[PDB]
Amino acid sequence: RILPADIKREVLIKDENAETNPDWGFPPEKRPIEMHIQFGVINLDKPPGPTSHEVVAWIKKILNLEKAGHGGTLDPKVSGVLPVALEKATRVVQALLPAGKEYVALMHLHGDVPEDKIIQVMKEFEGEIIQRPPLLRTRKVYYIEVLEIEGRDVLFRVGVEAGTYIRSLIHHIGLALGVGAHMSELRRTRSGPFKEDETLITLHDLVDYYYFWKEDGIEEYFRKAIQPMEKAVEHLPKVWIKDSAVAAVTHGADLAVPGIAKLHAGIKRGDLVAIMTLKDELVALGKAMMTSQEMLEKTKGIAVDVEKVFMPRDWYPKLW
Amino acid sequence: FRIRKCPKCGRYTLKEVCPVCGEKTKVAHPPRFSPEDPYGEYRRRWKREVLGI
RNA sequence: GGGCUCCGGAAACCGCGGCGC
RNA sequence: GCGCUUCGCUCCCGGAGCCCACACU
RNA sequence: GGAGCGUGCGGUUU
Incomplete structure (x- = not known):
């Protein structure tokens, strides 16, 4: 990887x-805590459900922030790494935009095919792709890694160059493989320098820690929440x-x-x-x-x- | 949502355990959130507990 | 003349048009 | 019918503010 | 106020 x-x-x-x-x-x-925020970005784990901006929406309100923004727009249903940059640090997002991105996927084939062929074909992509959705700019797939195959479900990881759409990559494989396939579930594992490590935190943790800070006056937790x-x-x-x-x-x-x-x-x-x-x-x-x-x-x-x-x-x- | 994690050893999989390290799997796609957040204080109390707040 | 920072509809509710259940 | 149709960012333009700066002998 | 990442326009009013 x-x-x-x-x-x-x-x-x-x-x-x-x-x-x-x-x-x-x-x-x-x-x-000082109060300025660490002015100059922080939270490594957010976006839940499914809310659009990516509508998350940032709540992050603002709940933390009485004014002005905060997010990294690569992660769609409604995708979960995972969503850097959200705060206050004066907002524009650091610029930095993020044209960096790597890794996803865990779960393509689902619209028909059966020989396990190894799936592997053979997906490995075919490791390199440059010309984007072909349903009936013009080239995009890199730094690597695909197939984790598990069960029936027509194919759970894999994949790394891509800024602004690859995984749905397409899959639809493509879909056609490549002959049967056609649709993307079933997705999750972003890393945007560039924001990895799925100990710094990635969930809305809930974020809020609860922030309340530990206002109601309870403990700095620790809500600091380790935000990244400088x-x-x-x-x-x-x-x-x-x-x-x-x-x-x-x-x-x-x-x-x-x-x-x-x-x-x-x-x-x-x-x-x-x-x-x-x-x-x-x-x-x-x-x-x-x-x-x-x-x-x-x-x-x-x-x-x-x-x-x-x-x-x-x-x-x-x-x-x- | 079928993808699951076993975050300790950090491996995705659709299965129930990661035999490689024998940790049961939790669902990958992290608990949904509404700004409402009922259970808000109810969970807060449960956390305050495991920290001593 | 150039560089930087800040601002430039920051307002809820209403009619199509546009995607989704 | 219900939900979304943009947090914000970037380029240009207009306005306010700060500089003109090879980072010492 | 325009262009784009991203489908937009006409009415009561910070």
């Missing part, structure tokens, strides 16, 4: 010995920038080469990037105007056009 985001990079060092003053900053770790926006870019290639630069990119400065402290391998021209402090907080998002190596060897020009900034201003002192 390998998607495009599970390849490990190297941490490339530009300023071999640099330091950050704690006095101006809030690391993801110890932010940093985890919404974990999948993106990051560049760590030195303190002075932080203040700048905040105000609308495109980040220039001699701001870089640490870097990630294999960046290219026009790739999304996460600008980070040495405290490992999200500063902003941009397109690299300069490859990985290019950024490390040089001191002339600009690394990344800055295009969206999350980090607030007063957080770092101006100084430039």
Whole structure:
């Protein structure tokens, strides 16, 4: 099970010995509860039933939030991973959108067929697909894995490139296999950096923990409920920038080469990037105007056009 | 909804047990929710209990 | 002149049109 | 008949606000 | 206020 985001990079060092003053900053770790929310995203496990937005709907009301949004629109009946980003962190969703997505499926064939043929055929897809629904853009299926076959039911997992519709993938197999098939049940196992781990939590848990916080004044639980926006870019290639630069990119400065402290391998021209402090907080998002190596060897020009900034201003002192 | 989990060892399956690790399976597609949420305080009390709140 | 942040119908109830039981 | 027909996001445009910033000698 | 992810338009009124 390998998607495009599970390849490990190297941490490339530009300023071999640099330091950050704690006095101006809030690391993801110890932010005051009330602002951890302003800058959080919940790894939600969407129940079946509600449309994906109508969930976010209730998340707002019930937590007296104003403005929150969700990741890849998961349909009414699908359950599973639905990152919902809160308050000021709302737009981190941008980051999520064009990342991997893994599903567990349950296709149901409209007629019998030899177990191995099902396997043979589905394995046929591992690669590029041209989308053919019932009677034009290509989409990758990073891998299919068949768990179990019972009669005409075929429970599998599958990983896909942003905006594959699993219904179709199935309908397609359906035709491929000869008999025709329909998708019976679906569930999203991961959107990009949001996995089905210990951080994925259910509406109910979320609310109950939040009440433990208001009625009962326990912070713990309702904190471990929300994830700090940093985890919404974990999948993106990051560049760590030195303190002075932080203040700048905040105000609308495109980040220039001699701001870089640490870097990630294999960046290219026009790739999304996460600008980070040495405290490992999200500063902003941009397109690299300069490859990985290019950024490390040089001191002339600009690394990344800055295009969206999350980090607030007063957080770092101006100084430039 | 037929898909089931056995979340401890994290394996989906339509069966009742994951023999590989002998954990019974629960249904995959997580408990439905209505903003009404009756049983709200009723469950809350059950939780407060296993934590000591 | 460019970059960034914020806002730009944020209102319930009513008639088709459009998908679903 | 009952439910949904959009939380919100992105590009442009209009308005308000902040900067003009290679991140020190 | 437009375009798109996503099927939209005409009436009592923040």
